[PDB]
Each structure stands twice: as structure tokens, then as C-alpha cells.
Enzyme design. Structure first.
Site, PDB file in Angstrom:
ATOM      1  N   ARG A   1      -6.923  -5.119 -13.963  1.00 26.49           N
ATOM      2  CA  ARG A   1      -5.717  -5.833 -13.551  1.00 26.49           C
ATOM      3  C   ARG A   1      -5.556  -7.122 -14.350  1.00 26.49           C
ATOM      4  O   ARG A   1      -6.534  -7.799 -14.671  1.00 26.49           O
ATOM      5  CB  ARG A   1      -5.701  -6.116 -12.044  1.00 26.49           C
ATOM      6  CG  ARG A   1      -5.114  -4.980 -11.202  1.00 26.49           C
ATOM      7  CD  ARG A   1      -6.127  -3.863 -10.993  1.00 26.49           C
ATOM      8  NE  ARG A   1      -5.530  -2.673 -10.387  1.00 26.49           N
ATOM      9  CZ  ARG A   1      -5.421  -2.473  -9.077  1.00 26.49           C
ATOM     10  NH1 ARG A   1      -5.864  -3.390  -8.229  1.00 26.49           N
ATOM     11  NH2 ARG A   1      -4.869  -1.358  -8.616  1.00 26.49           N
TER      12      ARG A   1
ATOM     13  N   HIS B   1      12.579  -2.757  -6.772  1.00 25.74           N
ATOM     14  CA  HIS B   1      11.432  -1.864  -6.809  1.00 25.74           C
ATOM     15  C   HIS B   1      11.623  -0.802  -5.742  1.00 25.74           C
ATOM     16  O   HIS B   1      10.931  -0.798  -4.717  1.00 25.74           O
ATOM     17  CB  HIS B   1      10.179  -2.691  -6.530  1.00 25.74           C
ATOM     18  CG  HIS B   1       8.894  -1.970  -6.784  1.00 25.74           C
ATOM     19  ND1 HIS B   1       7.691  -2.409  -6.272  1.00 25.74           N
ATOM     20  CD2 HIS B   1       8.610  -0.882  -7.539  1.00 25.74           C
ATOM     21  CE1 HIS B   1       6.722  -1.604  -6.676  1.00 25.74           C
ATOM     22  NE2 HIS B   1       7.252  -0.669  -7.444  1.00 25.74           N
TER      23      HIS B   1
ATOM     24  N   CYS C   1       2.165   2.787  -0.881  1.00 27.62           N
ATOM     25  CA  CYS C   1       2.742   2.791   0.466  1.00 27.62           C
ATOM     26  C   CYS C   1       3.736   3.935   0.678  1.00 27.62           C
ATOM     27  O   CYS C   1       4.430   3.987   1.700  1.00 27.62           O
ATOM     28  CB  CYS C   1       3.374   1.435   0.819  1.00 27.62           C
ATOM     29  SG  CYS C   1       2.161   0.097   0.960  1.00 27.62           S
TER      30      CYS C   1
HETATM   31  N1  LIG Z   1      -0.387   8.502   6.748  1.00 30.86           N
HETATM   32  C1  LIG Z   1       0.584   8.628   5.703  1.00 30.86           C
HETATM   33  N2  LIG Z   1       0.184   8.454   4.326  1.00 30.86           N
HETATM   34  C2  LIG Z   1       1.180   8.575   3.299  1.00 30.86           C
HETATM   35  C3  LIG Z   1       2.514   8.849   3.611  1.00 30.86           C
HETATM   36  N3  LIG Z   1       3.203   8.905   2.420  1.00 30.86           N
HETATM   37  C4  LIG Z   1       2.341   8.676   1.425  1.00 30.86           C
HETATM   38  N4  LIG Z   1       1.121   8.453   1.934  1.00 30.86           N
HETATM   39  C5  LIG Z   1      -0.129   8.219   1.222  1.00 30.86           C
HETATM   40  O1  LIG Z   1       0.082   6.978   0.492  1.00 30.86           O
HETATM   41  C6  LIG Z   1      -0.747   7.052  -0.680  1.00 30.86           C
HETATM   42  C7  LIG Z   1       0.090   6.674  -1.856  1.00 30.86           C
HETATM   43  O2  LIG Z   1       1.306   7.371  -1.671  1.00 30.86           O
HETATM   44  P1  LIG Z   1       2.410   7.285  -2.818  1.00 30.86           P
HETATM   45  O3  LIG Z   1       3.496   8.247  -2.425  1.00 30.86           O
HETATM   46  O4  LIG Z   1       1.835   7.623  -4.170  1.00 30.86           O
HETATM   47  O5  LIG Z   1       2.887   5.760  -2.848  1.00 30.86           O
HETATM   48  P2  LIG Z   1       3.453   5.001  -4.101  1.00 30.86           P
HETATM   49  O6  LIG Z   1       4.290   3.849  -3.584  1.00 30.86           O
HETATM   50  O7  LIG Z   1       4.380   5.886  -4.982  1.00 30.86           O
HETATM   51  N5  LIG Z   1       2.171   4.442  -5.012  1.00 30.86           N
HETATM   52  P3  LIG Z   1       2.812   3.813  -6.402  1.00 30.86           P
HETATM   53  O8  LIG Z   1       4.177   3.273  -6.103  1.00 30.86           O
HETATM   54  O9  LIG Z   1       1.923   2.680  -6.951  1.00 30.86           O
HETATM   55  O10 LIG Z   1       2.930   4.884  -7.437  1.00 30.86           O
HETATM   56  C8  LIG Z   1      -1.202   8.503  -0.846  1.00 30.86           C
HETATM   57  O11 LIG Z   1      -2.575   8.623  -0.588  1.00 30.86           O
HETATM   58  C9  LIG Z   1      -0.485   9.238   0.196  1.00 30.86           C
HETATM   59  O12 LIG Z   1      -1.318  10.241   0.770  1.00 30.86           O
HETATM   60  C10 LIG Z   1       2.920   9.031   5.022  1.00 30.86           C
HETATM   61  O13 LIG Z   1       4.035   9.270   5.295  1.00 30.86           O
HETATM   62  N6  LIG Z   1       1.944   8.911   6.038  1.00 30.86           N
END
Ligand SMILES: Nc1nc2c(ncn2[C@@H]2O[C@H](COP(=O)(O)OP(=O)(O)NP(=O)(O)O)[C@@H](O)[C@H]2O)c(=O)[nH]1
Ligand SMILES: [Mn+2]
Length: 599
Positions: free
Chosen positions: A83, A251, A275
Site C-alpha cells: 500500500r 466510487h 464491501c
Molecule cells: N455476508 C455478505 N458478504 C458479501 C456480500 N456481498 C459481497 N460480500 C463479500 O464481500 C467480499 C468482497 O466483495 P466484493 O463484491 O468483491 O466487494 P468490492 O467492493 O467489489 N471489493 P473491491 O471494490 O475492492 O473490488 C467478498 O468476500 C464477498 O464474499 C453480501 O451480500 N453478504
């Protein structure tokens, strides 16, 4: 052996239609002293030529085409994945205009440091001049840029992540404005010296000059440090442009949701990293008659149309996703996008048959070569096979659920803006704001447990100017808008947990049930409780048909506990104090009003 620009190979055949571009290129080349200058055209023949050179240099290995057509694996220097927020700067003329969420340096001091670093930094290397366009090429005010870089990896990735080359260069005309983005890996070579697969420097700077819309990057070849459209232009520079020009650079994912009456709704949603943006952007609804299509999973640029509504465009052209966690059951649409090939993977593992793997992916491969080139063995090796922040870089056009509107210059009208983060307690599954100004407060105070970190509108690492002024900008845009045409604002939390540690809400595809309530609220077809923090549905307001879940858990997910919210107040107050002198009165108003409603 210093060369005047006009004698550097490639500059005698440079395009001359845009003299401003040419003069800038000449000045940069005079400074960095590359072996030659190449203007990139974005063509497929160019892409393969650059890929061949990357394979020869060891930067890329070609993946098995029977499993991924036209795809490559890059392994970086392990030192270049760390980072570098502390090395990322907003160099506005005055420190206050960078603000408490940004790292500032006097721009004169910064230019002195970086111009020194740039002197001769490209010796032994090709300097690429990469014209690109952020967003569809048919826009009213197309936001154009040129990244100069000494990294072939950067060129290939920019071709996927932006609309790169000939069309963008032509759109610049003879004197069009463009963002000047300068990049070097900071690893000059002596004549005849053997290069490494992933050149970089121990000295890193990722610097932004908001006034002139310039980006100067040195020393890293990786990700958002080097692919200068990804965050540097899309959010940091663009947020400053949006501030001055009356629009929003955010974002946010962009989602198209179609109801059983076959009406489309478009949502923009801002969640901090990890998230759930990518999962929501590629939602597969779990209730009959509801369909979803994607327009983006990272950046949204929103501008008012003549009809008074806010329209979103995705300024990017590809997905740059975190690979670990992505799998065929959590996100099959992402996997299908990747399966179509044309993908560069960075720091994932290599299978014995030339496929790729990462933690979380199906398959249980027994042996792999890990991201450092070492042997890895199933249920034995104690280190991750893929780097935990490894990446795929894939064309958006390959996504099977891509909305047809994805390349429309006008964008899509946004019905709802969502904010959310990871909160174990306190924040309900979904809440609707009371009005726009309250929605701004909800975004401004977004918390995520990544101690609760405040990450306003998920822009904490990405604002191009003072966070308080940014809140004021949001307030201004709503104040001067037709209230009836503004997106409604919603606050979500997929992550609330019960005392036994389990998620109260199953999430993922089941989030379609939350989006259904949101659509119904937009259409005035749904009720909800009036609570001190906004409108929150009761269990009976949600469609839980066919959902194997205890209703008490959903009730708990939706609870608004006054005591919990009273504990939240001083955390929000500490944050609003941190925002500093530029905190808008409108945001303080909403804090006061929340405290009053809570009693
Ligand atoms: N309990 C739960 N976990 C979730 C949910 N949606 C996504 N996650 C979990 O959140 C983590 C990251 O999810 P992701 O979809 O990649 O988020 P992101 O914002 O796109 N990460 P980035 O933006 O940095 O690429 C994953 O491990 C996924 O399993 C949900 O609705 N419920
Ligand atoms: Mn993501």
C-alpha cells in the site's frame, strides 16, 4: 549522449495535428531520455506486438488458450504490491484545498522533487504515448487523457481499462484539452543491460495537481499507481473537475434492475473496498420476474440531463477486479466474463495445465506455481498461492449480463443512490433517507469496520479536494435541482451479525429482495417505519417468499435501537470535527436533527 527531442527516434514521425500534445511529449522525452517514442493506436495488431514483447521480457507468460483465449499471467516484484497511500498526494496550491483526508505538499516543492526523479529515468526504454478517452467516445464533453509511460504492461492494461488509441487521439482535435498523465517505473537501463520482468523503484510518488488536471506517477508499475485512468483520473482528478463543472465523479457501481412489469431502474451504489460492489453490480436476483444487468462495478460519473434527472456513465472500459474470493458460486457472471479470455491476470497462481487459480476458486488443484514462482501443494503449503490482492484485468464487453446501455454517451437515469459499509451492529439492513440533504449526511458519515472507519461516500482515499467542500458540492447539486427528479438515497448494511456471530441476512442474490423494496419505495408502492435515522421496512414490508430464513433474524437485521444510535453519535461527532473548518452547516444540521430525533 543526451539527445535533443527532435533526434529521439519516433518523434520525427509523431502526429502533428495537436501541437500542444506534441510539445508536451517533446519536453517530457527531452527530460526522461528514452531510447525511442511510440504513439499507441489501440489496435489489435499493436496489442499482440506488445504482448509478444512482454512474453519475451518475462513479464507475461501466455496462458493455455483452450482455457483462456488470448490471456496472460504477470508476476510482479513483491515490493510493488504494498500500500502506498502515504506516497499519494494532492498538490493543490493551498493545503486547505487538499484537506484532512488527503496528503498535501506544496506543488512547487513536489515538482522540484519529481522533475529530479524524472531526469534520465527512461534511459534504455521505450516511451509510450497513450491517448485515451474516459467514457463513451460520443459524449458532449468527452474527458480525454494521454498517459506517457515507460511500461509495456501499463499500455496493454490501459487498452483494456480505457478506450485507448486512435479514436481518442482524433477526438483531441488540434487543440482539445486533455489530462496530462506522466508515469515512469523509475528503473533506467544502461545500453546492453538485462532488464527484469517487473521493473520498479524503491522511491514511489503518485501525485495529483488538481488545478492543471495533471497526474505524475513515479516508481510503481502496479495497478492504480500506474494505470492512471483507474483511480487517479476517474476519481481524484475527475472529482476536482466535477466540483468546478457541476457534476459528480463517484466510487459507485451502476446497476440496472428490471422488474416483473419489465420496467428498468438504474442504481448507483457506493461501498468501500471489500464491501460488496462487484457482487451487487453483477446481481442475480432470487425472486421470479426480476432481472439485473451491469453497467459498472467501480466508478460512476453523474451529470444532470436536460430533463432534470441525474444520468450515470461508467468512464472505464474494463474490469480490474480482485481475484481471490471470486468464484463460480459467489459470482458466476464475473467468472464468465473472465472465461471469455482477453484477460491479464496479475499475481495469481499457475496450474499444471496452464490455467490460473486463486484462493476461493473451485478446483482444489494439487500442485500450483504460486505468485512468486515457487511450488505450492494442496493442504501443505502454508502461504497463499495467489497474492491476497491479486487482479484480473478484463474487457467489460465480455460480461454476459452487460446492459445494452453500457456504451451510451448519455448514460442512464439514476433512480436511487445507495451507500453502505460493513457494520456488525447498529445500522439496519436498509434505510431510506428523509430527503436529499439527509442523504448527503448519510453518505458523509458512512462507517465501515475496516473500530469504525468513516469513509464518506466511499471516497476517503480518492477525493481530489477538501472533504468539507465535497459535502457542500453534494448539498449544492441537490439544492439547485428539481427535488422530484433527484435520486432517492438509501443506506444499506449486508453485514449485521447476531450474538452468535452469524449474518442476520443471507445477502448476495437475496439482496434483490432489498432492491425490490427500494424500487417499491421509488414507485410509492411500499411502506416502512418512520425511525430517527430514516424510513426502515418492517419484516412484513419485505418479500421473503421462498427465502429459508428465520423472520426474527430479518427483524433483528432491520432493528433501530436507540441506545446503539446514541453510542454512534459521538463517533459521528468526532468525524465531523475531523472534517474541519470546511464542514458544511447543512451536514452539521443533519447531525443535530438526528440527535434530536433520537432523544
Ligand atoms: N455476508 C455478505 N458478504 C458479501 C456480500 N456481498 C459481497 N460480500 C463479500 O464481500 C467480499 C468482497 O466483495 P466484493 O463484491 O468483491 O466487494 P468490492 O467492493 O467489489 N471489493 P473491491 O471494490 O475492492 O473490488 C467478498 O468476500 C464477498 O464474499 C453480501 O451480500 N453478504
Ligand atoms: Mn470489486
Amino acid at each position: 549522449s543526451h539527445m535533443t527531442s527532435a533526434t529521439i527516434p519516433g518523434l520525427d514521425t509523431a502526429p502533428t495535428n495537436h501541437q500542444g500534445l506534441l510539445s508536451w511529449v517533446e519536453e517530457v522525452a527531452e527530460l526522461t531520455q528514452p531510447d525511442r517514442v511510440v504513439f499507441t493506436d489501440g489496435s489489435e495488431e499493436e496489442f499482440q506486438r506488445l504482448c509478444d514483447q512482454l512474453v519475451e521480457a518475462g513479464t507475461f507468460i501466455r496462458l493455455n488458450p483452450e482455457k483462456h483465449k488470448n490471456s496472460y499471467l504477470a508476476l510482479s516484484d513483491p515490493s510493488d504490491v504494498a500500500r502506498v497511500e502515504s506516497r499519494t498526494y494532492i498538490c493543490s496550491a493551498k493545503e486547505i484545498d487538499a484537506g484532512p483526508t488527503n496528503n498535501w505538499m506544496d506543488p512547487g516543492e513536489m515538482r522540484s522533487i519529481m522533475k529530479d526523479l524524472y531526469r534520465g529515468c527512461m534511459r534504455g526504454r521505450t516511451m509510450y504515448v497513450v491517448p485515451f478517452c474516459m467514457g463513451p467516445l460520443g459524449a458532449e464533453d468527452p474527458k480525454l487523457g494521454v498517459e506517457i509511460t515507460d511500461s509495456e504492461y501499463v499500455v496493454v492494461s490501459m487498452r483494456t481499462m480505457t478506450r485507448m488509441g486512435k479514436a481518442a487521439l482524433e477526438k483531441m482535435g488540434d487543440d482539445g484539452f486533455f489530462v496530462k498523465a506522466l508515469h515512469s517505473v523509475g528503473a533506467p537501463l544502461e545500453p546492453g543491460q538485462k532488464d527484469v520482468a517487473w521493473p520498479c523503484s524503491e522511491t514511489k510518488y503518485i501525485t495529483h495537481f488538481p488545478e492543471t488536471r495533471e497526474i505524475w506517477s513515479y516508481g510503481s508499475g502496479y495497478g492504480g499507481n500506474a494505470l492512471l485512468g483507474k483511480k487517479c483520473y476517474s476519481l481524484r482528478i475527475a472529482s476536482a473537475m466535477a466540483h468546478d463543472e457541476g457534476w459528480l465523479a463517484e466510487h459507485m457501481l451502476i446497476l440496472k434492475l428490471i422488474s416483473p412489469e419489465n420496467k428498468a431502474y438504474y442504481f448507483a451504489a457506493a461501498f468501500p473496498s471489500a464491501c460488496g460492489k462487484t457482487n451487487l453490480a453483477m446481481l442475480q436476483p432470487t425472486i421470479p420476474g426480476w432481472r439485473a444487468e451491469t453497467l459498472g462495478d467501480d466508478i460512476a460519473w453523474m451529470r444532470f440531463g436536460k430533463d432534470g434527472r441525474l444520468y450515470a456513465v461508467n468512464p472505464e472500459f474494463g474490469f480490474f477486479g480482485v481475484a481471490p474470493g471470486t468464484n463460480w458460486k459467489s459470482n458466476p457472471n464475473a467468472m464468465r466474463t473472465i472465461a471469455a479470455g482477453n484477460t491479464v491476470f496479475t499475481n495469481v497462481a499457475l496450474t499444471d495445465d496452464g490455467d490460473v487459480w486463486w484462493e476461493g476458486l473451485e478446483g482444489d488443484p494439487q500442485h500450483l506455481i504460486d505468485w512468486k514462482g515457487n511450488d505450492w501443494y494442496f493442504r501443505e503449503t502454508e502461504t497463499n498461492a495467489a497474492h491476497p490482492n491479486s487482479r484480473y484485468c478484463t474487457p467489460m464487453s465480455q460480461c454476459p449480463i452487460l446492459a445494452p446501455e453500457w456504451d451510451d454517451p448519455q448514460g442512464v437515469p439514476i433512480s436511487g443512490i445507495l451507500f453502505g459499509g460493513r457494520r456488525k451492529t447498529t445500522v439496519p439492513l436498509v434505510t431510506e433517507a428523509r430527503d436529499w440533504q439527509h442523504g448527503v449526511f448519510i453518505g458523509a458519515t458512512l462507517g465501515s469496520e475496516q473500530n469504525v472507519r468513516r469513509d464518506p461516500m466511499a471516497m476517503l482515499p480518492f477525493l481530489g479536494y477538501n472533504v468539507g467542500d465535497y459535502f457542500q458540492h453534494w448539498i449544492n447539486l441537490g439544492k439547485h435541482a428539481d427535488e422530484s427528479k433527484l435520486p432517492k438515497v438509501f443506506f444499506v448494511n449486508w453485514f449485521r451479525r447476531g450474538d452468535d456471530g452469524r449474518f442476520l441476512w443471507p445477502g448476495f442474490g437475496e439482496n434483490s429482495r432489498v432492491l425490490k423494496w427500494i424500487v417499491d419505495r421509488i414507485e410509492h408502492k411500499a411502506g416502512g417505519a418512520t425511525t430517527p435515522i430514516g424510513t426502515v421496512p418492517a419484516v412484513e414490508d419485505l418479500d421473503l417468499d421462498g427465502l429459508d430464513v428465520d423472520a426474527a433474524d430479518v427483524a433483528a437485521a432491520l432493528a433501530v435501537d436507540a441506545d446503539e444510535w446514541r453510542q454512534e453519535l459521538p463517533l459521528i461527532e468526532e468525524w465531523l470535527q475531523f472534517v474541519g473548518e470546511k464542514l458544511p452547516t447543512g451536514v452539521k444540521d443533519e447531525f443535530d436533527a438526528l440527535k434530536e430525533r433520537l432523544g
